[PDB]
Scaffold this active site. Structure first.
Site, short mmCIF file in Angstrom:
data_model
loop_
_atom_site.label_atom_id
_atom_site.label_comp_id
_atom_site.label_asym_id
_atom_site.label_seq_id
_atom_site.Cartn_x
_atom_site.Cartn_y
_atom_site.Cartn_z
N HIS A 1 39.84 40.15 45.04
CA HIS A 1 39.37 40.31 46.09
C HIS A 1 39.05 41.07 46.87
O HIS A 1 38.87 42.15 46.33
CB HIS A 1 41.14 39.24 46.47
CG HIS A 1 41.71 40.28 47.04
ND1 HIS A 1 42.23 41.31 45.93
CD2 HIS A 1 42.92 41.23 47.98
CE1 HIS A 1 43.77 42.34 46.72
NE2 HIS A 1 43.77 41.77 47.22
N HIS B 1 40.14 43.48 48.76
CA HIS B 1 41.40 44.53 49.73
C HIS B 1 40.43 45.97 48.57
O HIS B 1 40.32 45.56 47.33
CB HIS B 1 42.80 44.36 49.56
CG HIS B 1 43.29 43.80 50.68
ND1 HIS B 1 44.43 43.35 50.46
CD2 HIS B 1 42.97 43.94 51.57
CE1 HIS B 1 44.81 42.42 51.45
NE2 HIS B 1 43.87 42.83 52.56
N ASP C 1 42.15 47.42 46.21
CA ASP C 1 43.01 48.02 45.51
C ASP C 1 42.57 47.14 44.49
O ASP C 1 42.51 47.56 43.18
CB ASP C 1 44.09 47.37 45.36
CG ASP C 1 44.81 45.65 45.99
OD1 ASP C 1 44.20 45.47 46.13
OD2 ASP C 1 45.93 46.02 45.95
N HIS D 1 46.71 34.80 49.44
CA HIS D 1 47.57 36.53 50.01
C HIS D 1 45.63 36.76 50.87
O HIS D 1 46.40 37.94 51.84
CB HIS D 1 47.66 37.33 48.38
CG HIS D 1 47.12 39.02 49.11
ND1 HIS D 1 48.09 39.77 49.58
CD2 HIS D 1 46.01 39.85 48.75
CE1 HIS D 1 47.67 41.26 49.30
NE2 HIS D 1 46.53 40.98 49.30
N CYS E 1 46.39 39.79 43.40
CA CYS E 1 47.82 40.23 44.33
C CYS E 1 48.19 37.97 45.46
O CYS E 1 48.69 38.78 45.70
CB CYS E 1 46.59 41.06 45.58
SG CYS E 1 46.72 42.37 44.92
N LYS F 1 52.69 36.68 43.14
CA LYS F 1 53.58 37.70 44.70
C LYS F 1 55.45 37.14 43.20
O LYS F 1 55.72 36.61 44.26
CB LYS F 1 53.78 37.74 45.75
CG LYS F 1 52.35 38.89 46.08
CD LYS F 1 52.91 39.98 45.86
CE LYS F 1 51.63 41.08 46.08
NZ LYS F 1 50.66 40.83 47.93
N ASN G 1 51.98 42.47 51.38
CA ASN G 1 50.87 43.11 52.83
C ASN G 1 51.00 41.08 52.64
O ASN G 1 49.76 41.09 51.99
CB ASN G 1 50.09 43.98 52.72
CG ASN G 1 49.20 44.23 53.36
OD1 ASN G 1 49.66 43.87 54.90
ND2 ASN G 1 47.98 44.19 53.32
N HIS H 1 50.84 44.15 41.22
CA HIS H 1 51.92 45.17 42.07
C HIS H 1 53.10 44.86 41.83
O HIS H 1 54.20 45.48 42.22
CB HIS H 1 52.03 45.20 43.89
CG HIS H 1 50.80 44.52 43.88
ND1 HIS H 1 49.88 46.07 43.76
CD2 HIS H 1 49.54 44.21 45.02
CE1 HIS H 1 48.93 46.27 44.98
NE2 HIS H 1 48.20 44.63 45.37
ZN LIG Z 1 45.02 42.79 48.88
ZN LIG Z 2 46.88 43.90 45.93
#
Ligand SMILES: [Zn+2]
Ligand SMILES: [Zn+2]
Length: 216
Positions: A74, A76, A78, A136, A155, A158, A164, A194
């Site tokens: 994705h 983001h 990270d 996410h 991400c 979860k 976030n 994460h």
């Molecule tokens: Zn993300």
């Molecule tokens: Zn992430």
């Protein structure tokens, strides 16, 4: 502050962990994978930084494992921080078309290879990409290693909290997580971004966390 780590998870499968300071989260870990196909490496997500991306590439390259490409789960940073660095060394970068569009709207360098539609083989019968729906982020995808029964859930997975919510689709996530659960119930391992590697149960825990989060 903590150093990049690379640990063997299974035959031809490694987890890379990198770390960033994020406001109101403190130190956040980020898991990706490196998959070996015929003794060449595929990056599943880049570290946050060009520095950690260089270190990850060098570790495999020094050991005779040419980097064949990266796929970002994705938009983001990270998942995508190391795209620019990978592009500057002519390593093929892969992202969904929507991941590239969001990268570009966010002023970020894009993958040199895009795919659209729900299923896409990065390497046929070895690295599959599935879009389960928005969660996410609108663009989040998962990477399935059929040979090892290993889902990189990125991400989207979860299991203890949704993290976030800034770009999250809280309405859609439960349906997405529903679909992801049905498709990959047979996963031996599930690798979130994460939190630590677990089993199929992480699929259930993510559905529950999505249902729960939508309720507020
Ligand atoms: Zn993300
Ligand atoms: Zn992430």
């Amino acid at each position: 502050l903590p150093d990049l780590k690379i640990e063997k998870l299974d035959e031809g499968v490694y987890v890379h962990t990198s770390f960033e300071e994020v406001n109101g989260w403190g130190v956040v870990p980020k898991h990706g994978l490196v998959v070996l196909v015929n003794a060449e490496a595929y990056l599943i997500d880049t570290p946050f930084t060009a520095k950690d991306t260089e270190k990850l590439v060098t570790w495999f390259v020094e050991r005779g494992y040419k980097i064949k490409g990266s796929i970002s789960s994705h938009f983001h940073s990270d998942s995508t921080g190391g795209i620019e660095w990978l592009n500057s060394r002519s390593i093929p970068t892969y992202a969904s078309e929507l991941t590239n569009e969001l990268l570009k709207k966010d002023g970020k360098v894009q993958a040199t290879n895009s795919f659209s539609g729900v299923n896409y083989w990065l390497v046929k019968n070895k690295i599959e990409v599935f879009y389960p729906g928005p969660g996410h982020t609108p663009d989040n995808v998962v990477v399935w290693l059929p040979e090892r029964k290993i889902l990189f859930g990125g991400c989207f997975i979860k299991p203890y909290g949704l993290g976030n919510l800034g770009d999250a689709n809280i309405e859609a996530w439960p349906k997405s997580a529903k679909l992801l659960k049905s498709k990959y119930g047979k996963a031996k391992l599930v690798v979130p971004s994460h939190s630590e590697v677990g089993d199929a149960s992480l699929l259930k825990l993510t559905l529950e966390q999505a249902v729960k989060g939508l309720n507020e």
